[PDB]
Amino acid sequence: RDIAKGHLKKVTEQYPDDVEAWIELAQILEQTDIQGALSAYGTATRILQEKVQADVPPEILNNVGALHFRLGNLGEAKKYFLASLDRAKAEAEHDEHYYNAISVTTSYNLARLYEAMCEFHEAEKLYKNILREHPNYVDCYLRLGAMARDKGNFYEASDWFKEALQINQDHPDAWSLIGNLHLAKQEWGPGQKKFERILKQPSTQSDTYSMLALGNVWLQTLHQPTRDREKEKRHQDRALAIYKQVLRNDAKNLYAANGIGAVLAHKGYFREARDVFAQVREATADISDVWLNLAHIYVEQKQYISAVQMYENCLRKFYKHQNTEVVLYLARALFKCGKLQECKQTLLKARHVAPSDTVLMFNVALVLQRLATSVLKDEKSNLKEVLNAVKELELAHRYFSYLSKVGDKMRFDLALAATEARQCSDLLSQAQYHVARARKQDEEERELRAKQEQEKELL
């Protein structure tokens, strides 16, 4: 490609009546910066009208619209695709160049765009129009399942993906999508190894995708209290071997180092996890996983100042606003004033979208208790706050009574709420003691204002 680029740089300056030179310019720059190819097609579109009045072939408008499809010019790319379809339809005599295939690919990109233009009805219609004329096509039949998969992972998505594999078992994309199906329900933890090892035959080898799927599914087995049984150490070693193997054959793969940092953090090297995660961050930090793995290291070293922002940024994406896992990771060792009262605000924001989780209902009570003990033990503070703390403690006690009746828990029984009840009892006693102090401060301020008013009367 370097010699071709140099040759294009030579043909660009001079003008020996260049017509297709810019076409070759853009054909290489599609992998590189997407604006160079757009510029080349922009100039190539107008260079085809001086020799004769010949309409632009649909293949160039189609490719420029494809270039714009990745960009924010969704409407402009839509116009390009529609005009390409119009032009390709006019090719009644270009049976050798197969205008039909050109229309098929243009419509494929157009349906991909409509699926991306918040219009899945038109995307379904267009992809079906491709199906009705060419059932031997895979990508349309695979995107249809993706569309049905948004509503749920048990609808026609799970059926179409397997029908697409059954028609082409040598399609790595379809088989990987098959493995992706089992990811919704992780009950297939150990058993997904088999279905992920179907196309691990040497003919398909080497495939980094499936190997990293194995590494992930092997990492998921971690975070268990059975490590002392020499079971999770072996799992760490196996996954580490997988990551080393995918590292030797591919040193530039970021996910291998991502997992290596994950396990090393699991090995207790957080001081040494930042260095490994640094290369992954510097390569491309716009992946949802790194913002959290790094925030874990920051929140581990008593740096919530550098962890809350990382959790906010991952939520800046247009997929949700209140995720449960991010907020769960948000409150780890928060004890400061701006990290308790506000922590309640974010906890309530999270529970608003799905209150059915027990961990939220337990953490809200814990932070309520922390504030109450933080205002009813060593304070001697404002009075209205002593009035509100008893209400907060009563709500916490009601949640203590309610949480005890729930059957299932966070893979750990909550029978240890008794100490919380005793804590709230002695907190009630301390509150009934400190309300008298509140009244004493009230009479103190009253006599202070009186002894100031007398001086003002003197003046």
Binding site: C118, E119, F120, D150, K151, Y319, K320, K349
Partner: protein
């Protein structure tokens, strides 16, 4: 089709719901909003301007739902504090506080007759409390996961319920019995409302599709592609010609109830919109959200 009023910093904390009147009983001119700052602000939309009339407090936790009685100028506000407090827009005072304990308190549902108040229950049932009683009159025995949305029909003939897994439960407020169970969604239903004629039922699930079903024969009237994020709030135009849709992507699309086409879209909100509601005539479209800015959208 544009924006008339722009209330900057309408609240200290994010607004999760908005209530505006439709009748002439001193409700269409006053806007009641509920935010997470424990401020039940009674805004009076007087002189085509959003002016504050009352500032009601008392809720321990942030307001989750606000609605204005259809045949009555009073209002009420619920929260997750299990203390559903009734209010009055005639005096800015509290009528009562239904202690829907211990945690069993969700969005409100004013009856069209303004005599019953439906509230979701964590056990999956729908408790129907009395407005002037406060005691649990009768509970719908349709268990499951949880009630995420409850809506009363304008003329009081049906009642639907949004579950956590896309389960519409068509009840009968005329007899208190489950008639249909529409399960066309697998996503948690955020909110829903009845058509002004009680014939169409829009569902705001977390799939981005506005699947408008029918209530008379419990069938789907058409799948409408909504926004890219989750549709949070949805309301019908009082004259019954269009319906707005609030999503989680700073987009206020006004979809057509007849042609299933977006007739206009607003992008004035910097954050996600949580509440959208019409005026008494359907020209002004009030909106709230995490931006904490009340936008009044005029569509003549």
């Amino acid at each position: 089709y544009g924006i008339l009023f722009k209330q900057e910093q309408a609240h200290d904390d994010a607004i999760w719901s908005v209530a505006w009147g439709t009748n002439k009983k001193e409700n269409s001119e006053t806007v009641v909003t509920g935010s997470l700052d424990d401020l039940v602000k009674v805004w009076k939309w007087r002189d085509e301007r959003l002016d504050l009339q009352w500032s009601l407090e008392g809720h321990q936790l942030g307001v989750v739902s606000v609605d204005i009685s259809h045949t009555l100028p009073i209002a009420a506000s619920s929260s997750l504090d299990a203390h559903i407090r009734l209010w009055d827009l005639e005096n800015g005072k509290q009528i009562k506080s239904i202690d829907a304990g211990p945690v069993d308190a969700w969005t409100l549902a004013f009856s069209p007759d303004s005599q019953y108040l439906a509230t979701g229950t964590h056990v999956g049932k729908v408790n129907i409390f009395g407005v002037e009683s406060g005691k649990k009159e009768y509970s719908l025995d349709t268990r499951g996961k949880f009630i995420l949305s409850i809506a009363y029909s304008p003329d009081g003939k049906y009642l639907a319920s949004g579950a956590i897994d896309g389960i519409i439960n068509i009840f009968d407020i005329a007899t208190g019995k489950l008639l249909h169970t529409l399960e066309g969604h697998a996503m948690p239903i955020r909110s829903l409302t009845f058509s002004p004629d009680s014939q169409l039922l829009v569902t705001a699930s977390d799939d981005g599709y506005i699947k408008i079903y029918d209530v008379q024969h419990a069938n789907l009237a058409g799948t409408l592609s909504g926004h890219a994020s989750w549709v949070l709030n949805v309301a019908f135009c009082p004259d019954d010609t269009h319906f707005v849709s609030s999503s989680s992507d700073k987009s206020v699309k006004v979809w057509d109830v007849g042609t299933r086409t977006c007739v206009h879209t607003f992008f004035d909100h910097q954050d996600q919109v949580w509440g959208v509601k019409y005026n008494g005539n359907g020209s002004k479209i009030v909106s709230v959200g995490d931006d904490q800015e009340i936008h009044i959208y005029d569509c003549p």
